[PDB]
Design an enzyme around this catalytic site. Structure first.
Site, PDB file in Angstrom:
ATOM      1  N   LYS A  48      85.839  24.652  62.969  1.00 38.02           N
ATOM      2  CA  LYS A  48      87.153  24.320  63.463  1.00 38.02           C
ATOM      3  C   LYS A  48      86.622  24.119  64.972  1.00 38.02           C
ATOM      4  O   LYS A  48      85.721  24.594  65.302  1.00 38.02           O
ATOM      5  CB  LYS A  48      88.090  25.634  63.680  1.00 38.02           C
ATOM      6  CG  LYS A  48      89.385  24.756  64.784  1.00 38.02           C
ATOM      7  CD  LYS A  48      89.886  23.660  64.304  1.00 38.02           C
ATOM      8  CE  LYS A  48      91.070  23.220  65.817  1.00 38.02           C
ATOM      9  NZ  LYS A  48      92.039  22.369  64.748  1.00 38.02           N
ATOM     10  N   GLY A  51      96.457  21.549  68.508  1.00 35.88           N
ATOM     11  CA  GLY A  51      96.900  22.019  69.667  1.00 35.88           C
ATOM     12  C   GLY A  51      95.199  22.484  70.268  1.00 35.88           C
ATOM     13  O   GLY A  51      95.241  23.858  70.542  1.00 35.88           O
ATOM     14  N   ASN A  69      83.585  17.470  68.807  1.00 34.02           N
ATOM     15  CA  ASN A  69      84.472  15.936  68.381  1.00 34.02           C
ATOM     16  C   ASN A  69      84.400  15.403  69.828  1.00 34.02           C
ATOM     17  O   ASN A  69      84.730  16.386  70.998  1.00 34.02           O
ATOM     18  CB  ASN A  69      84.886  17.520  68.376  1.00 34.02           C
ATOM     19  CG  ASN A  69      86.460  16.761  68.006  1.00 34.02           C
ATOM     20  OD1 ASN A  69      87.759  15.225  68.594  1.00 34.02           O
ATOM     21  ND2 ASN A  69      87.800  17.038  67.765  1.00 34.02           N
ATOM     22  N   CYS A  97      90.625  15.256  72.262  1.00 36.40           N
ATOM     23  CA  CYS A  97      90.779  16.288  73.329  1.00 36.40           C
ATOM     24  C   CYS A  97      92.424  16.535  73.939  1.00 36.40           C
ATOM     25  O   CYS A  97      93.383  14.516  73.515  1.00 36.40           O
ATOM     26  CB  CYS A  97      90.299  16.753  74.851  1.00 36.40           C
ATOM     27  SG  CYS A  97      89.745  14.363  75.484  1.00 36.40           S
ATOM     28  N   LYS A 124      81.841  13.037  66.791  1.00 34.17           N
ATOM     29  CA  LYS A 124      83.768  12.585  65.342  1.00 34.17           C
ATOM     30  C   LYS A 124      84.012  11.855  65.991  1.00 34.17           C
ATOM     31  O   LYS A 124      84.259  12.141  67.466  1.00 34.17           O
ATOM     32  CB  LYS A 124      83.922  13.951  65.549  1.00 34.17           C
ATOM     33  CG  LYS A 124      85.355  13.791  64.737  1.00 34.17           C
ATOM     34  CD  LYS A 124      85.285  13.826  63.077  1.00 34.17           C
ATOM     35  CE  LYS A 124      86.516  13.806  62.835  1.00 34.17           C
ATOM     36  NZ  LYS A 124      87.396  14.995  62.410  1.00 34.17           N
ATOM     37  N   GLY A 133      91.741  10.106  54.706  1.00 28.14           N
ATOM     38  CA  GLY A 133      92.389   9.225  53.217  1.00 28.14           C
ATOM     39  C   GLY A 133      91.611   9.493  51.906  1.00 28.14           C
ATOM     40  O   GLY A 133      92.044   8.975  50.675  1.00 28.14           O
ATOM     41  N   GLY A 178      90.351  15.876  54.686  1.00 28.58           N
ATOM     42  CA  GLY A 178      91.789  16.686  55.637  1.00 28.58           C
ATOM     43  C   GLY A 178      92.613  17.247  54.867  1.00 28.58           C
ATOM     44  O   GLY A 178      92.646  18.113  54.300  1.00 28.58           O
TER      45      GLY A 178
HETATM   46  C1  LIG Z   1      95.454  20.530  60.688  1.00 29.66           C
HETATM   47  C2  LIG Z   1      94.428  19.927  61.068  1.00 29.66           C
HETATM   48  C3  LIG Z   1      93.963  20.138  62.237  1.00 29.66           C
HETATM   49  C4  LIG Z   1      92.377  19.251  62.418  1.00 29.66           C
HETATM   50  N1  LIG Z   1      92.392  19.667  63.839  1.00 29.66           N
HETATM   51  C5  LIG Z   1      90.460  18.612  64.100  1.00 29.66           C
HETATM   52  C6  LIG Z   1      89.988  19.320  64.522  1.00 29.66           C
HETATM   53  O1  LIG Z   1      89.290  20.591  65.362  1.00 29.66           O
HETATM   54  N2  LIG Z   1      88.729  18.763  64.933  1.00 29.66           N
HETATM   55  C7  LIG Z   1      88.134  17.265  64.643  1.00 29.66           C
HETATM   56  O2  LIG Z   1      87.413  16.758  64.790  1.00 29.66           O
HETATM   57  N3  LIG Z   1      89.302  16.710  63.843  1.00 29.66           N
HETATM   58  C8  LIG Z   1      90.471  17.708  63.071  1.00 29.66           C
HETATM   59  N4  LIG Z   1      91.981  17.042  62.174  1.00 29.66           N
HETATM   60  C9  LIG Z   1      91.231  15.715  61.797  1.00 29.66           C
HETATM   61  C10 LIG Z   1      90.284  15.825  60.417  1.00 29.66           C
HETATM   62  O3  LIG Z   1      89.454  16.333  60.755  1.00 29.66           O
HETATM   63  C11 LIG Z   1      90.185  14.444  60.062  1.00 29.66           C
HETATM   64  O4  LIG Z   1      89.444  13.740  61.395  1.00 29.66           O
HETATM   65  C12 LIG Z   1      92.253  13.703  59.625  1.00 29.66           C
HETATM   66  O5  LIG Z   1      92.741  14.104  59.418  1.00 29.66           O
HETATM   67  C13 LIG Z   1      91.654  12.917  58.776  1.00 29.66           C
HETATM   68  O6  LIG Z   1      91.281  12.511  57.891  1.00 29.66           O
HETATM   69  P1  LIG Z   1      92.208  13.026  56.414  1.00 29.66           P
HETATM   70  O7  LIG Z   1      92.861  11.445  56.095  1.00 29.66           O
HETATM   71  O8  LIG Z   1      91.272  13.530  55.627  1.00 29.66           O
HETATM   72  O9  LIG Z   1      93.242  14.000  56.439  1.00 29.66           O
HETATM   73  C14 LIG Z   1      92.575  18.035  62.191  1.00 29.66           C
HETATM   74  C15 LIG Z   1      93.424  17.425  60.971  1.00 29.66           C
HETATM   75  C16 LIG Z   1      94.160  18.415  60.284  1.00 29.66           C
HETATM   76  C17 LIG Z   1      95.239  17.357  59.268  1.00 29.66           C
HETATM   77  C1  LIG Z   2      96.648  14.070  71.576  1.00 30.36           C
HETATM   78  O1  LIG Z   2      96.192  15.737  71.039  1.00 30.36           O
HETATM   79  C2  LIG Z   2      94.948  16.109  70.897  1.00 30.36           C
HETATM   80  C3  LIG Z   2      94.603  17.817  70.667  1.00 30.36           C
HETATM   81  C4  LIG Z   2      94.013  18.926  70.574  1.00 30.36           C
HETATM   82  C5  LIG Z   2      92.135  17.423  69.680  1.00 30.36           C
HETATM   83  C6  LIG Z   2      91.368  18.045  69.704  1.00 30.36           C
HETATM   84  C7  LIG Z   2      91.633  19.158  68.023  1.00 30.36           C
HETATM   85  C8  LIG Z   2      92.341  18.137  67.079  1.00 30.36           C
HETATM   86  C9  LIG Z   2      93.459  18.590  66.360  1.00 30.36           C
HETATM   87  C10 LIG Z   2      94.079  19.431  66.947  1.00 30.36           C
HETATM   88  O2  LIG Z   2      93.860  20.566  66.941  1.00 30.36           O
HETATM   89  O3  LIG Z   2      95.630  19.259  67.163  1.00 30.36           O
HETATM   90  N1  LIG Z   2      93.856  17.325  65.579  1.00 30.36           N
HETATM   91  C11 LIG Z   2      94.062  16.383  65.147  1.00 30.36           C
HETATM   92  O4  LIG Z   2      93.841  15.391  64.373  1.00 30.36           O
HETATM   93  N2  LIG Z   2      92.123  16.064  65.345  1.00 30.36           N
HETATM   94  C12 LIG Z   2      91.285  17.112  66.628  1.00 30.36           C
HETATM   95  O5  LIG Z   2      90.058  16.335  67.157  1.00 30.36           O
HETATM   96  C13 LIG Z   2      92.589  16.388  69.788  1.00 30.36           C
HETATM   97  C14 LIG Z   2      93.755  16.033  70.611  1.00 30.36           C
END
Ligand SMILES: Cc1cc2nc3c(=O)[nH]c(=O)nc-3n(C[C@H](O)[C@H](O)[C@H](O)COP(=O)(O)O)c2cc1C
Ligand SMILES: COc1ccc(CCc2c(C(=O)O)[nH]c(=O)[nH]c2=O)cc1
Ligand SMILES: Cc1cc2nc3c(=O)[nH]c(=O)nc-3n(C[C@H](O)[C@H](O)[C@H](O)COP(=O)(O)O)c2cc1C
Ligand SMILES: COc1ccc(CCc2c(C(=O)O)[nH]c(=O)[nH]c2=O)cc1
Lengths: 313, 313
Positions: free
Chosen positions: B44, B71, B128, B131, B165, B251, B272
């Site tokens: 995470k 968040g 990442n 933000c 990322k 996707g 994801g």
């Molecule tokens: C519940 C949730 C939490 C995520 N938290 C992060 C995160 O902490 N860091 C990050 O780089 N991307 C985060 N993402 C983005 C995912 O890594 C991924 O880039 C995005 O969901 C697109 O892939 P998918 O189509 O397989 O879901 C999060 C996505 C989801 C759905």
């Molecule tokens: C614009 O609001 C946010 C809040 C936190 C992040 C970083 C963590 C993150 C989150 C998240 O923890 O909300 N969700 C994602 O889809 N991608 C992420 O990279 C990125 C954007």
């Protein structure tokens, strides 16, 4: 129960219209859109001169949507102006004319000649900002300084209410900035959100190939892919531009999709990919479906729920 | 026959891993990902201090994908660093640690502590560049000057190969700029394309309500909605960053989807939304499906088709 709207000093039987670029390039197309149950139509985004556009294949559709790199094929401004001036039957429905000049000077030249026809016949201008400027720079609506220049020059040249077609944005800071630029221009009376989601890439697994020829297969995405992006942009501009109308475009295939647009803030609702795929009969279906949702909910008019999306807590 | 590969001085049993943020927040989650058939795992994204994140509901999923405004909830850097240093079993698979500090200084402070653990244990860094939104400025990856500062400072502070990322881009000029920035930094050895598509909005027709509580329902989109977006970014950066690896994310629900990511240029493929929905069983299915498509095509290795998507003329 009714779908009627009155806006921009025109009357609309229902909120549905084509999205620019779909079923609107030729006289045949415009006659077809006029004969349909849509509440309005928009012409193909035009340039001063006719364009052939990009090599084919340049549009493809699939269950979840479409991709395109058309390259602005169109009959030229003089043809669309003539359609507006002499051919369109305004007793049927209102007409929008979309322009997409390749430089600010090209847009200025066209709007100058549109204005008297807008004044006399009531054709409504949609300026496409989701459009090329100098190659190697971002599209105009992704370059806030260019966007400001275009709106300044077109506002001065045209001098009448108009609207703008916007690409989607993905960052709140862009919503904030873009809306603030738009709100500098009191003649911008409507904002259409959104144009296609830019530069996607569809690949066919069997052939291991991209599906469109131009730009190494990269092109704009429409359809089911883009509905939540569309809704976000409609609602973002609805909130930030309280003195302007918002028209919604993206991902509409059903009356339910249209209902969601309208909850988000949409006044008019435009139909691109689904219309391209289903044809103009889609408008009777969408009308019926929207009215059925309204009857189930007890809504009698669109203003009862437009912009009324609820948030949580 | 088998899908094992070597990248970044590590061996991987297959190209699959979780996407950051999914199934990777707690020690329980990391142990579960480790026990799965994935080729790797990523933790995470973390901050120096623990965070509770945003109010619930903050994730929702639907047939076409997901929306989230989590968040950045996380257990804090000290926890992930201890997992990397003391708990993770490197004999099982490689580990990536995702960092998302809220300033350049916070990222520099975390990477200075991660460096000796990277040297001793081989944990890999994913920085990442997305933000929480701050009124008045865009996300870092959408501000190229900021992006260059972050990478300059992290490169200096860390001194070892790392990845980044990236959020999606939608404009070819942006692809050119972003890739030029990345290519300034030789220690950036992998780029992961993409993060969620920002600020979409999902509305429920029955309730007339948004579906997540933070940010008036706006949140990042994942899943089927974003596949062509994800492919386009993977291929755009694969073409523009020949001395880097590209990791695909977005996707992936099937071995066919993974096949397309690899065709576009992906070295690893992250999962994801589909992983959140199906659970860690998904990895055996994706392996089987990918091997089945390879067999039908006559491919014996991933290298035979990685980046080999065909264009038309
Ligand atoms: C519940 C949730 C939490 C995520 N938290 C992060 C995160 O902490 N860091 C990050 O780089 N991307 C985060 N993402 C983005 C995912 O890594 C991924 O880039 C995005 O969901 C697109 O892939 P998918 O189509 O397989 O879901 C999060 C996505 C989801 C759905
Ligand atoms: C614009 O609001 C946010 C809040 C936190 C992040 C970083 C963590 C993150 C989150 C998240 O923890 O909300 N969700 C994602 O889809 N991608 C992420 O990279 C990125 C954007
Ligand atoms: C084949 C095709 C041509 C298009 N041409 C234009 C155009 O000339 N001007 C414009 O503003 N938008 C154009 N677009 C964008 C659509 O107007 C619309 O914004 C986009 O397709 C999203 O709506 P949808 O999801 O209903 O397809 C075109 C779209 C398609 C599919
Ligand atoms: C990459 O080449 C172009 C050239 C012109 C435009 C503007 C016209 C346009 C087109 C088009 O004619 O290609 N397609 C869309 O999805 N939306 C548009 O606004 C968009 C892209």
């Amino acid at each position: 129960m009714c779908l009627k709207l009155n806006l921009l000093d025109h009357v609309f039987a229902n909120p549905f219209m084509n999205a620019a670029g779909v079923l609107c390039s030729t006289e045949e197309d415009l006659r077809c859109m006029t004969a349909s149950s849509s509440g309005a139509l928009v012409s193909k985004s035009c340039t001063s001169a006719p364009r052939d556009g990009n090599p084919e294949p340049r549009y493809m559709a699939f269950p979840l949507g479409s991709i395109n790199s058309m390259g602005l094929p169109n009959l030229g401004f003089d043809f669309y102006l003539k359609y507006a001036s002499d051919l369109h039957d305004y007793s049927k429905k209102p007409l929008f004319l979309s322009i997409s000049g390749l430089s600010v000077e090209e847009n200025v030249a066209m709007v100058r000649r549109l204005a008297p026809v807008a004044q006399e016949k009531g054709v409504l201008l949609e300026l496409n900002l989701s459009c090329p400027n100098v190659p190697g720079k971002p599209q105009v609506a992704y370059d806030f300084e260019a966007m400001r220049t275009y709106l300044q020059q077109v506002s001065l040249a045209y001098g009448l209410p108009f609207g703008v077609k916007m690409p989607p944005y993905f960052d709140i800071a862009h919503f904030d900035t873009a809306a603030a630029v738009l709100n500098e221009f009191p003649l911008v009376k409507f904002v259409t959100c959104v144009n296609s989601v830019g530069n996607g890439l569809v690949i066919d697994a069997e052939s291991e190939s991209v599906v469109i020829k131009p730009k190494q297969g990269f092109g704009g995405l429409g359809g089911k892919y883009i509905l939540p992006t569309a809704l976000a942009n409609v609602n973002a501009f609805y909130r930030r531009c309280p003195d302007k109308l918002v028209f919604g475009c993206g991902g509409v295939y059903s009356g339910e999709d249209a209902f969601l647009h309208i909850l988000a803030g949409a006044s008019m609702v435009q139909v691109g990919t689904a219309l391209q795929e289903e044809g103009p009969g889609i408008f009777t279906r969408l009308e019926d479906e929207l009215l059925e949702i309204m009857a189930r909910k007890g809504y009698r008019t669109l203003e009862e729920f437009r912009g009324r999306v609820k948030t949580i807590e």
